Every structure is written in structure tokens, then in C-alpha cells.
Amino acid sequence: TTPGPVMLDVVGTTLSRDDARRLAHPNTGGVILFARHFQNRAQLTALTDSIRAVREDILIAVDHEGGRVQRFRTDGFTVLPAMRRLGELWDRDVLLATKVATAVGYILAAELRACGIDMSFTPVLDLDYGHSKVIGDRAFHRDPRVVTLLAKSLNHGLSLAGMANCGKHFPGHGFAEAVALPTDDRTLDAILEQDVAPYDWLGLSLAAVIPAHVIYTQVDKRPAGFSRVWLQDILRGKLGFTGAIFSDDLSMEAAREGGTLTQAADAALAAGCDMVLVCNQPDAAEVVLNGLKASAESVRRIKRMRARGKALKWDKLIAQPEYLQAQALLSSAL
């Protein structure tokens, strides 16, 4: 089987008959996990194993950013700092900050792969303007050059465990704050010269992208996730990006602008998304699976988000010097 364009979630800590039906649908391509799917490491591994048993080509992801966004914080998972902490460390010691960023990346990816997960929806590349509360301390730094090199060092640590990455929220969620959709009335050039710069500078170190549920009125009235201008003209065209594009959670009502989930899913894919996220309502996601009108190009990019190579099980990772080394550095540096 080949991955479909829909990423959804399962009902709980153990796979159900309804999950198996949904996982087997041709338009299913991924699973995203949340805190309700984690009891302990043993349970989570059995869950991810059973998911791949139903659909061997499935992509399994999770929002593991650190700080305020980390689904798995217990039973050995290292509580990671808010990315804003790394920008603050950068301001005291640039090179040390890049060293810690990689260690955070490797810890993050290694622990996730030990439980059978492919990727995390990280890093946040939004600039820390201080404007967006939903972003807040999830942003690395105000300076796009600092965001680039810190995020790059983190993506390097992810790659050391064979894990990819996903920058967000394109073209930038940091400026709009802004219950309807946020709006950003800056000019295209202003958005390109700063918020978009990390996506451009990261080059091949950027594996994927999530667009923002934000309307940039001076560029396109459609939200970035449903904007062919942003996803094709800018990202694919002007920047030459060839990585995967995941929509932001379509379950966010205001993002759909009066349309159904299925209609919003068709618009996102039509705009340029390779995969769409429908979180926290599997039955509504199943309606999308069966009503979707919309692959060759996308399937290639989706397959390339699978974790590369073999992963260390927990019994092996806990005794690995590199893992132990990263743990110590994180404690001392922060």
C-alpha cells in the first residue's frame, strides 16, 4: 500500500476495530499522537507496532517541540526546554547554543524512535516578535539568522537518529496575534525578508513544512494552508522547496471559512499540501477519507518523511554514551 494524503489520530492507548478500518483506507497516510495516547513506553511501543501492522507504509508523527508542546513527558521521556531558552543561551554563548540544540535534537529523535515514531512536528521557525501568544516561547529567537542556525543545529540532531523535521508555521506565525483567523497586513517583501528567510536559508536541512492558518491580506485572501500563492508560487517556486507540506490541523474551525472538513481538505491539497491533518475527531476524519476528491509527486515526499535506518530500542539507548552525553550537556547548559 502507498500512503494517502490524510493524517489522523486513533481513539486511545490500544488500537480499536474502528482505527483498523480507518488505517486501512487508501487515503490514510499518517497518524499523529497526543497525550491521550501515552500511558508508558511499553504501551506506546505496542500501539505504534499495531498501527504499522495494519498499515506498514504509515507515517507516525507527534508534536514534540519542547516546553509547552511535548505530548510525552513521563516514563523516561526527557522534558525538553522551550525553544526560546535556546535563543537566550545563544545570546550568552552562540557556539554552545548550537551544541545544545543538536543534543536536544538527538535526545528528541532517539527517544521517539525507541517507541516506533517516525517524526516530530518541529522546529518552530516563527520569529519571536512577542506578538503571537499561541507561539510565545515556542519560538527560538527574534533574529531570523539565529532561528536558522539554531533550528539547523536541532535538525542536525534529529538527523543523527535518522529523523526528519518540519518547519512551521509558513510563511510565519510570529507577527500576527491577531474566533476567526489571524491576519497579517504586511507586504510580501517584508514577509520574505524576515519570516520566510529561515525556510530559504535552511536549504536541504529543511525536510518539510506546515503552513500557518493565517491570512496575509496583502498577498492572498486565502489562508496560507489553502493558498496556492504561498505553497506553490513562493515555497515551491521562489524557494525551490521540494520537501513535504502538511496542513495545519484542519479541525481548527476558523481555518475552513464556512466549509466542511472535506472541502477544506480538498482546498489544502489543491493549494499544494501533500498531506492534511485532521486531529481529535477520527469519525469526521473518516468522512474526509471517503469524500476526498483528490499523488505521485506527493507520495515521494511523504515516503521521505519516514525515519531512516534502524533505531535503538530503549534497552540499548539508555546505555549509549552519545545519549548519556547529550543528557548531561542539557542539564549543565540549562
Ligand SMILES: CC(=O)N[C@H]1/C(=N/OC(=O)Nc2ccccc2)O[C@H](CO)[C@@H](O)[C@@H]1O
Ligand atoms: C499554530 C499552531 O500552534 N498550530 C499547531 C496545531 N494546532 O491545532 C489546533 O489549534 N487545533 C484546534 C484548535 C481549536 C479547535 C480545534 C482544533 O496543530 C498541529 C498538529 O497538532 C501542530 O503541529 C501545530 O504546530
